[PDB]
């Protein structure tokens, strides 16, 4: 019995499962920061569930086998090519940005579904909120055009007007020279090509816009590089603050039921990520779409429904 209006009618009330410990938390930081390490510690200490940052092949992990598919069949973009050629002629920058934003939207929907179904809270890296800072960095550096940010804004507003912002925002602050040194120490051959201006734009786009917007409606915990190492103080700060300004207290059983119906059925979640606006960076010709879709169908467990694949090994096909 999957969740539905009937289950809500009989027994399924999601306001009972919330026990003041849910507290959906997003840990946001600058490129190559210690936030990932910090997020893991918070989830371990508070008993929540940690969601690793959504990448190019995040959606491939949740459908069928967790093994990622080919780059052509999932994303059609690469981060290394963006680092090597930020001003690539074939519009790789926007395609990467949109695929990452939609992956983050899917991850947020999955996290909300888990929270509402189980009651155990979640910890996230950069969410759909704060993802616009990378777009601003790309635009100011000149990587993408203005129509690009207009389309991104349209998609973002349409998709995000239906989700609850996170309870707590945790920000790790690292100065630009320090993270440049960290990048040099990292050793990834593509990452030292990141210009200092790009990181400065990311940081000041974080500080000037995202932080006040989260502050006016949520709780903000700005942490420096040193003081973020001690997770005990972070957890104590998380417990001490009380959430009374966001929409979460105003939600009831009916609104929670509507949100739980929305977060599952991922097609509606991703419905507006493919609005019919034809930018050259994201649009695909008919022949290319046909060929790629045909190649996708030939994958082992993708021709039919999940339970109706003979080659994978599903049996009793003629009676399901």
């Amino acid at each position: 019995l999957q969740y539905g209006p009937l289950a809500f009618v009989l027994g399924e009330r999601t306001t009972r499962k919330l026990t003041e410990t849910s507290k959906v938390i997003t840990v946001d930081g600058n490129i190559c920061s210690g936030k990932g390490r910090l997020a893991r510690e918070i989830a371990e200490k508070l008993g929540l569930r940690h969601f690793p940052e959504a990448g190019i092949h995040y959606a491939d992990s949740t459908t069928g086998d967790g093994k990622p598919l080919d780059v052509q069949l999932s994303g059609n973009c690469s981060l290394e090519k963006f680092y090597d050629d930020p001003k690539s002629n074939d519009g790789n920058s926007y395609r990467l940005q949109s695929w990452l934003y939609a992956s983050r939207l899917l991850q947020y929907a999955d996290a909300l579904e888990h929270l509402l179904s189980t009651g155990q809270g979640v910890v996230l890296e950069r969410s759909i909120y704060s993802d616009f800072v990378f777009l601003e960095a790309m635009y100011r550096q000149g990587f993408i055009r203005k129509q690009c940010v207009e389309h991104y804004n349209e998609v973002k507003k349409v998709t995000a007007c239906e989700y609850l912002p996170p309870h707590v925002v945790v920000y790790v602050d690292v100065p630009v020279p320090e993270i440049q040194s960290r990048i040099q120490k990292k050793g990834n051959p593509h990452e030292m090509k990141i210009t200092a201006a790009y990181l400065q734009d990311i940081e000041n786009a974080y500080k000037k816009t995202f932080l006040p917007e989260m502050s006016e409606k949520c709780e903000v915990l700005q942490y420096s590089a040193r003081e973020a190492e001690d997770a005990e103080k972070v957890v104590e700060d998380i417990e001490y603050l009380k959430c009374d300004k966001g929409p979460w207290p105003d939600q009831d059983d009916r609104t929670f039921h509507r949100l739980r119906m929305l977060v599952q059925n991922k097609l509606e979640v991703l419905n507006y990520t493919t609005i019919p606006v034809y930018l050259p960076e994201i649009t695909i010709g008919a022949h290319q779409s046909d060929r790629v879709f045909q190649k996708f169908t030939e994958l082992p467990g993708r021709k039919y429904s999940p339970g109706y694949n003979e080659d994978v090994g599903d049996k009793w096909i003629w009676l399901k």
């Binding site: 959606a59 459908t63 695929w99 097609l267 493919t274 994201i282 649009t283 779409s289 046909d290």
Partner: protein
């Protein structure tokens, strides 16, 4: 809203329609219309937004005016003959006013202006319910008094409705407005045979309801509202586009598909009463409906429009909710021509 409240409101709408259909008193019929209107408004406003509110208020104003006109007609009929039973109207003015009231309720031209806007403002589910279920009470009332209706008024209103639906469907791009104009044209077709044979009216109503239910369920399945959103569908579920094109061809009156059964039969009936010019005019007018259906089919299935990159992610997820009776609706709306004589069942 709460699922229990939504179910209760739907039951109340159906109960109002049933009360209209099973009652032999004018006052009880008016009560059924009032109950239907009262419970139908929140269904339009299930998804709260300014467009839904404006559509709901337009619908309320039109329905309230129609109900008041209907009550005035009932009062005049009672005055000139102390009878409450729904039978011969016994008065020309009362019959004329009741015909206008039922035209307002149905959506026949020139009282058709509210249908496209109400359909556009409200959601697909609300629109589907409004387009098919609402027609049952006014059509039943019109069938019950078909022996008294003036043929001139009904025939001219039906002709105007067909013309207006055909002309207005050409311009629209949003699918909901196309469906509204399609409904207007189909009702112009269906009410033209009321003075002659009500069985043809019922048969056309059933066929139209099946076709529009199938098309609205297909539109809900592939969540598309504008034409381009429908053009994007072929990249994910080509079967849906193919079935939608077949249903669109059926809705245009192309034989041997099911949609040809009513028109043909209706023409036959009007030929038995030595009415030749009008059926020809309505056929050449339905050619316009066929044209914009064909344009929609060209946009949707017969050609492959450019896609979008993010659509790749939609390839990995399946439709979680499946609506039952969709295959049955498609089959009934496409391949039931060879069983045409079953209309003798007085359906």
């Amino acid at each position: 809203m709460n699922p229990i409240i939504y179910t209760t409101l739907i039951m109340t709408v159906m109960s109002g329609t049933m009360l209209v259909m099973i009652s032999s008193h004018w006052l009880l019929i008016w009560i059924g219309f009032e109950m239907n209107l009262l419970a139908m408004i929140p269904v339009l406003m299930k998804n709260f937004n300014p467009r839904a509110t404006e559509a709901a208020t337009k619908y309320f104003l039109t329905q309230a005016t129609a109900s008041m006109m209907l009550m005035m007609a009932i009062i005049i009929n009672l005055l000139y003959s102390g009878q409450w039973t729904i039978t011969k109207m016994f008065n020309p003015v009362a019959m004329t006013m009741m015909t206008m009231a039922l035209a307002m309720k149905l959506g026949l031209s020139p009282f058709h202006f509210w249908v496209p806007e109400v359909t556009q403002g409200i959601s697909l589910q609300a629109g589907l319910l409004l387009l098919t279920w609402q027609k049952l009470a006014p059509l039943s009332v019109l069938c019950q008094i078909s022996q008294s209706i003036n043929p001139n008024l009904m025939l001219t209103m039906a002709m105007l409705s067909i013309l207006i639906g055909g002309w207005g469907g050409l311009n629209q791009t949003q699918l909901r407005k196309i469906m509204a104009y399609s409904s207007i044209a189909h009702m112009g077709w269906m009410t033209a045979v009321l003075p002659y044979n009500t069985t043809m009216t019922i048969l056309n109503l059933l066929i139209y309801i099946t076709m529009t239910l199938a098309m609205f369920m297909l539109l809900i399945h592939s969540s598309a509202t504008t034409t381009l959103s429908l053009s994007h569908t072929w990249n994910k579920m080509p079967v849906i586009t193919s079935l939608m094109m077949v249903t669109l061809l059926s809705m245009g009156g192309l034989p041997p598909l099911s949609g040809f059964m009513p028109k043909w039969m209706i023409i036959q009936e009007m030929t038995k009463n030595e009415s030749i010019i009008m059926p020809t005019l309505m056929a050449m007018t339905a050619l316009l409906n066929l044209y914009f259906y064909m344009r929609l089919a060209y946009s949707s299935s017969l050609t492959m429009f450019p896609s979008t990159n993010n659509m790749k992610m939609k390839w990995q997820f399946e439709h979680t909710k499946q609506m039952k009776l969709l295959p049955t609706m498609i089959v009934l709306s496409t391949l039931v021509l060879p069983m045409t004589p079953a209309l003798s069942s007085l359906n």
